[PDB]
């Protein structure tokens, strides 16, 4: 059962692709019965306040150091345009740490290269925006193999997704820590993704059961 | 020269905005001959607010050092307070905005804020649900202009479902012009539908 939740937040980070992950953890309000909110603890490199690529000023809640992942902790990696930046590099580090106790990593968009780029993703199944692309920017991505269209992929404590699909993310990552029935967690997308109101009967009724 | 505002109040939701904000701010889609638009948050004041996801905002301008001008835009996302009194100041505001030309965009519980006040009376608009709009919202008399939408665009005001961000998002784009029409069916297609040759066509008309 995931105890913690952490979003980890930089410059440039991409808005719409954490967005519906963050809402239903945070409020849990379409958890399963007994089940309170996941908080998302925001995570910076440091303390010093970022901006969205949407321009939103945020302030870290703590700082990686002040942080620990430990065996089905949740963190979340955003995309955004600054990922080999070398800024980032302490986090990655840490990755490969968290990877091993067993803290669930949900990567989208750019930060999918991040990890390809650092060796995580040779042996693990994984998506990320385009192969072609991740080979290019990636000299010790060796995943090749274990690569999928997605867009959005789960292995063991790891979901990675193209930034096209932040629904498809949430949904993965959702189920993994297994926070919603599975009613609830089709129903809900279901509804967002067709919006069709049959899903919102659905979801009202399968949601705190 | 016209600019982007967005409220920014607790318990926003922060998956209604989000492809706006960062296409806008970004302006990585425009027209070759457009800088960015840039978002400047407005809070009700300049206090701290947290998002529905718990992201820690600090609004950049307090609404009364806002000026809204015609063809300014004003994005107001949903959340679960929009019936509280610290919001009465924006919602009155949001009058004159409309009266002076601000393309205001109102997403989910917005939409019903904007009801109650008969803003959307005599105004094509769409809810999250009209009998949820009805029963939540008392002096609302809009109910025949009401269309499910998820996204109704009138003249103006751009009203969306919180469950239709991509929906919204496409039609304040639309309604700024800030893409090619071409380059906005593609950016839709793509997000929609997730095929690749969306994203090559996306980026052979960002200019056309």
Same mark, same amino acid.
């Given at each position: 059962?995931?105890?913690?939740?952490? =979003?980890?937040?930089?410059?440039? +980070?991409?808005?719409?692709?954490? $967005?519906? =992950?963050? @809402?239903?953890?945070?409020? *849990?309000?379409?958890?399963?019965?007994?089940?309170?909110?996941?908080?998302?603890?925001?995570?910076?490199?440091?303390? /010093?306040? #970022?901006?969205?690529?949407?321009?939103?000023?945020?302030?870290?809640?703590?700082?990686?150091?002040?942080?620990?992942? /430990?065996?089905?902790? %949740?963190?979340?990696?955003? $995309?955004?345009?600054?990922?080999? /930046?070398?800024?980032? &590099?302490?986090?990655?580090?840490? #990755?490969? &740490?968290?990877?091993?106790? *067993?803290?669930?990593?949900?990567?989208?968009?750019? @930060?999918?290269?991040?990890?390809?780029?650092? $060796?995580?993703?040779?042996?693990?199944?994984?998506?990320?925006?385009? !192969?072609?692309?991740?080979? +290019?920017?990636?000299?010790?991505?060796?995943?090749?193999?274990?690569?999928?269209? *997605?867009?959005?992929?789960?292995? @063991?404590? =790891?979901?990675?997704?193209?930034?096209?699909?932040? !629904?498809?993310?949430? +949904?993965?990552?959702?189920?993994?820590?297994?926070?919603?029935?599975?009613? @609830? %967690?089709?129903?809900?997308?279901?509804?967002?993704?067709?919006?069709?109101?049959?899903?919102?009967?659905?979801?009202?009724?399968?949601?705190?059961?």
């Amino acid at each position: 059962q995931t105890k913690k939740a952490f =979003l980890y937040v930089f410059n440039t +980070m991409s808005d719409w692709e954490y $967005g519906y =992950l963050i @809402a239903e953890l945070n409020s *849990g309000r379409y958890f399963k019965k007994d089940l309170a909110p996941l908080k998302v603890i925001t995570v910076g490199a440091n303390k /010093e306040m #970022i901006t969205t690529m949407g321009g939103l000023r945020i302030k870290p809640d703590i700082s990686l150091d002040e942080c620990t992942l /430990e065996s089905k902790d %949740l963190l979340i990696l955003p $995309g955004g345009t600054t990922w080999s /930046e070398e800024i980032h &590099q302490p986090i990655l580090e840490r #990755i490969g &740490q968290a990877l091993k106790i *067993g803290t669930i990593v949900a990567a989208i968009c750019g @930060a999918t290269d991040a990890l390809a780029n650092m $060796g995580y993703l040779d042996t693990r199944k994984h998506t990320s925006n385009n !192969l072609e692309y991740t080979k +290019m920017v990636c000299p010790n991505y060796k995943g090749e193999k274990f690569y999928e269209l *997605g867009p959005a992929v789960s292995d @063991a404590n =790891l979901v990675t997704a193209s930034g096209i699909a932040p !629904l498809e993310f949430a +949904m993965e990552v959702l189920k993994k820590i297994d926070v919603f029935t599975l009613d @609830a %967690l089709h129903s809900w997308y279901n509804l967002n993704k067709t919006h069709k109101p049959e899903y919102f009967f659905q979801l009202m009724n399968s949601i705190n059961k």
